[PDB]
């Protein structure tokens, strides 16, 4: 004879949260008057790990100087030369995007990060001072997960 | 070029509330070491165990998460933030380092069920240009999948008990329809849920 | 009577790719109320997938996420115990079960169809135990 009994088995599954980052190294940069030039990509951020549906205003690169919107590179020689990039990307239909810098964004709306991964640009500004001379700076990329 | 990562072994904590602790995997899965230096934030009564400590190659440990001593609402979920840095070893030279940050729920034993029992409850309006959602459960709400009009919206949660007001892209002009899953306690996106916009 | 009991085992990391790892202890289904010298060919482990060797489990969230797990017990000197899964078998690990009760792993195989999704993953397994 067949006899029978029956069970409901249960998984539970969990996601971790990952976080990478990726830094390519931008071309060297060139003196001109003790400018830089401008737009000089300085480097090519590529976050990755997130979970599809983290926001670009949950990403705050953050440094020493806080300047919001602003990333501040000083150079390593006594003298406190600097200067001033921005972090800045696109969207799947090509508009202009930047996350969180010290606290805020410096162009476009909130948005949803590209699946996987997302590019981010680092662009040099200027010096608001004015005659440049290693430059160094030291970011933090928080990540607040939904 | 150069690489960076923290893993988190979940992307939430969910402390009951007088718990004595709960633990928590970090992941260094990089090939150099780091340290690894862990912070409460609000949205110390929460404790991290340790608070800094060295994470070799590809090597995960766990921190102790404890709460002594706080005072909490009973009638409503709190929100901390969890935040795990890996800090690496030590013309343009920029060094990063990821602060990987997760939320810390703080859930009263009194509350009643869990979220996704009442992730339906969400209701949903148009105002000044905004899309509101009000929550009337004791639980964030943590949307991680929004859309209205059949357009995407950046999500956030909802808090407990309260509203969220999301910002409009151009072309929602009369658009009435949501859709909406939350974060479920593991980290998975939950069931799609959909629903008009009332007056 | 046949009785059949459960134990779920660790929670399961949900890797990068949306996949997890193979031989995870999912869980332990325990069968016990059996005749004496029945053997593993006389248990056939179903489901409502079918999957002839495999259980399927499915996401609670209405979004049918699913991972595959096959059931294989152990015998006194660790060799595999494999019953009938959906009406199929492994070759060559047929056995005298345990004296009344036997404990099988339902191990996982991976991922069935997509990027699972954390949360609670269900199968209602019925057992049907033959030559009785």
Redesign the interface.
Known sequence: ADLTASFTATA???????????????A??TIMNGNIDTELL??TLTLG?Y?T?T???SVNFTDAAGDPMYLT?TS?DGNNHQFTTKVIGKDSRDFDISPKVNGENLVG????LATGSQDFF?RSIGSKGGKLA????????????? | ????????????IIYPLDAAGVMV?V?N?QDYPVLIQSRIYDEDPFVVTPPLFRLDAKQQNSLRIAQAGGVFPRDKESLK?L?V?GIPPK?????????????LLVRPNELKGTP?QFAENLSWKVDGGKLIAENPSPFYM????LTFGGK?I????IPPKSTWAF?L?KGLAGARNVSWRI??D???????YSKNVTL
């Open positions: 539970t599954l969990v996601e971790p949260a990952r976080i990478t980052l990726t830094y390519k190294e931008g060297p940069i300085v480097g790990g979970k549906g926001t670009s205003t590179f390593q709306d909130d948005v949803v680092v290693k430059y160094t700076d030291a970011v933090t990329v928080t990540v607040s997960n939904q | 070029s150069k690489e960076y990562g923290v893993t988190i072994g979940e992307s939430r995997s992941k899965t933030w935040c840095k013309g343009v030279f920029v060094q990063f380092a990821i602060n990987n940050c997760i939320k996704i943590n949307i991680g999948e995407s950046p999500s956030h949660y910002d892209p974060i479920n593991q980290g998975g996106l939950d069931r799609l």
